[PDB]
Symmetry: C3
Subunit: 334 residues, 3 copies
């Protein structure tokens, strides 16, 4: 087969929790979709008390952008490592076949550039992350991870076969930070990551994170930055994790359709309250709202949710329904 | 639809691991089932060495009672907070839709009372727990949790469709306690929970429990308080967890039918040895015994089972079967 | 039924990750397969820095050998405890029914021998381990565990029904060691296990392992001891765990067919990137390779993989495929 006959299309990626424009059903044969990502290292504030870390990011955000392609398309990515960085990076896709998911061919030193083309042969949601030889967990637990969705050429289907169309799509990436704290119980500071590597390893070896955040900060999805919807809309939430297990939960709602492993060739589950997403994988949930108000989106390890910071908010417009839930007797003195 | 035409029925709840009387198949249309729960705070001994904690409970037991209703019924709960308590409580159902599962409408200060009515629209086993704004994990990891079973209007079915009828039903609730210990390695004591909140938070932030118990105490289901059955009986064990993952295991037996997420609209699994129940969810297992004797029911994280206290016992009456298992040569010297 | 009419067959077990000779489809009725295992206690080096532990083993290896039988066969095991050991051991199968999986009938003091016969009535992969009264986690987290595969009498089938034949079969057993370290941060040494029991308990109570290894040592499956295959071959990897959850991942590949709980009466999953295997269970993955080169086989808790030592290697011979993955622009300066 000649690759030079398929059409080409350029896409510009958007900062999460929003996704770039796309169609839910394909209207073309296989194509060549062209993305562009610039690695960047920067200081990040990840809580209210002003805790600072040295994060490494794709396109300058934790997590990286969510790419969306169709099955049997050709994904061509152009990765740039500017001259102001200091480390060696390389991407690694869980959707590509062979050569360590592409990590053996995308090693770029500071001030370099590479291009990798692969074929998306399996539909579902997959995880991509950095993976340099000898520093994999340090690069991954600092923010170099993201997801990619390979939709089927015909669309999503329920357990029987009828199509499933969504109105909105959000992308939530959970991230666990292991910040090294000195003997007095205070977090430390450094100048460059090379001074932080040793303490980062020593803190990672304890297997317990210090922070767990949605979208790269505490409260990054609550307040004015909350997600939005209306009663009757259909939302697809793509949840991702790269190093640790997670159990998403939508307080007040359920999961109408859940791919907990994120593979669309399998029939989904029904009426899930809390599903488990293993570490190093992405899951998808499909929900249609039925009541207005504010919703919580948490990791139902309640200590990780309400003590470490893994919580977000939904705002849904609409009109109440006294048949589903009603307050018969308001709180009185007797 | 008029709610005032459906019949009403009052139910009195029973202390676990026993369940109140009910029918496995519905013989009426939708009804209104009326429960009553009184919150109560008390000192609990949770091990053999006499470790004391300040537990908060529904109806004065850890875990709370197990309610049983049918699909599309109307659950009306009347929650009372006596004047001798000191905190603010509110229930939160994972089976109700909207308003944070009912937590935004059931806040009762000490010496108050409220009534909440919702509609059980999805069959399966669900978790309910307390959830006050700012103290969710502290209230939940002290004993304010339980389960509720919404059976289908026609009964349980296997993976092909034939009905599944059980003879007995037991309810096991696993609970993890994070008891604060002082510098010498000894557990601390307090007078009221307000003095314990700070150390409780500091101990919870370590993500490792100090105790893990079945039915609210070490050895609460072993000895004379063990569960009972006979060879040929059919038992449904409803296992619950509210904060941490668990992996139940029946030593010597299996799981004939397992709903690991606890949703009956999904086909069960077959011949499970150890299934995983995520944190903040309830699962159901259906087993028919084939050999007499004593059985262990453990959390197959063996350190949590035999070092922290998550173990219980079954006593089964019947006659042995030399065909399944037999001792050919008893332990000899050669 | 008379047991004395079925044919008998002796099998000699092989050190992992290799399996003794067997057929994928049965060519006889039910038989009586005879195994032999000798318990042995020995000092093991489990890392590069020469950390020593006192391991207890079946047949002198961590993990124990993998037995393979067919459904409805009769497994007869003869367990020997030589006079040079010092503890009391007893095996415990998750595939047998009744009497604590066989632990109540196989207690052998040093210098003894026993024989146990049971019937394999459920197909799948199961875990067996030692379980003495009062020392279960200490005996299990020192290397006394393994797996057993009970194949169906007709062979493995995919989600629709077509047979699945494998060319090679490997067995990977993950093991977590809790080595006690003294106040200076150095691992301790002892003479006999009786001196190590107390510190072993105190270290186990922290719920965090110090080492996590494939096949009983760091780097035991990398280098010249890596697993081998060719492009187009079909491999069945049987992964086991006895105390802790694990999430296997094949970097560069996928899971074509996955039994994550390891029970063959259930339809497998498709196109898994990372599946979760609960603690105290065994799972099976079936993969056919499509690209040559070196593959990583890791626990995708990347801290446990690349910081504690849970990693192995595949070497696949064959010819590259520029259509699946290709390097369009090699790393350049621009
Ligand atoms: Cu990197
Ligand atoms: Cu990965
Ligand atoms: Cu409360
Ligand atoms: Cu909850
Ligand atoms: Cu032993
Ligand atoms: Cu076991």
């Amino acid at each position: 087969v000649d690759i030079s006959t398929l059409p080409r299309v350029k896409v510009d990626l958007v900062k999460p929790p929003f996704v770039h424009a796309h169609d839910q059903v394909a209207k073309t044969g296989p194509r060549v979709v062209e993305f562009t990502m610039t690695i960047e290292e920067k200081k990040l504030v990840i809580d209210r008390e002003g805790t600072e870390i040295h994060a490494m990011t794709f396109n300058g955000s934790v997590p990286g952008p969510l790419m969306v392609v169709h099955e049997n398309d050709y994904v061509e990515l152009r990765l740039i490592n500017p001259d102001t960085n200091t480390l060696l990076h390389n991407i690694d896709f869980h959707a590509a076949t062979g050569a360590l998911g592409g990590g053996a061919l995308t090693q770029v030193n500071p001030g370099e550039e590479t291009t990798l083309r692969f074929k998306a042969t399996k539909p579902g949601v997959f995880v991509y992350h950095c993976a340099p030889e000898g520093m994999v967990p340090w690069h991954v637990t600092s923010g170099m991870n993201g997801a990619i969705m390979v939709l089927p050429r015909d669309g999503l289907k329920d357990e029987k076969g009828q199509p499933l169309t969504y109105d909105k799509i959000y992308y939530v990436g959970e991230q666990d930070f292991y910040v090294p704290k000195d003997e007095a119980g205070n977090y430390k500071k450094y100048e460059t990551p090379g001074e932080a590597y040793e303490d980062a390893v020593k803190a990672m070896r304890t297997l317990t994170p210090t922070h767990i955040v949605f979208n790269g900060a505490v409260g990054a999805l609550t307040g004015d930055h909350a997600l939005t919807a209306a009663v009757g809309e259909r939302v697809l939430v793509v949840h991702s994790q790269a190093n640790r297990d997670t159990r998403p939960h939508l307080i007040g709602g359920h999961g109408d359709y859940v791919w907990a492993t994120g593979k669309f060739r399998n029939p989904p589950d029904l009426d899930q309250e809390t599903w488990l997403i293993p570490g190093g994988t992405a899951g998808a949930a499909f929900y249609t709202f039925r009541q207005p108000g504010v919703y919580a989106y948490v990791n139902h390890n309640l200590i990780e949710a309400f003590e470490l910071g893994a919580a977000g908010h939904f705002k849904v417009t609409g009109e109440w329904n006294d048949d589903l839930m009603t307050s018969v007797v308001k709180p009185a003195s007797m």
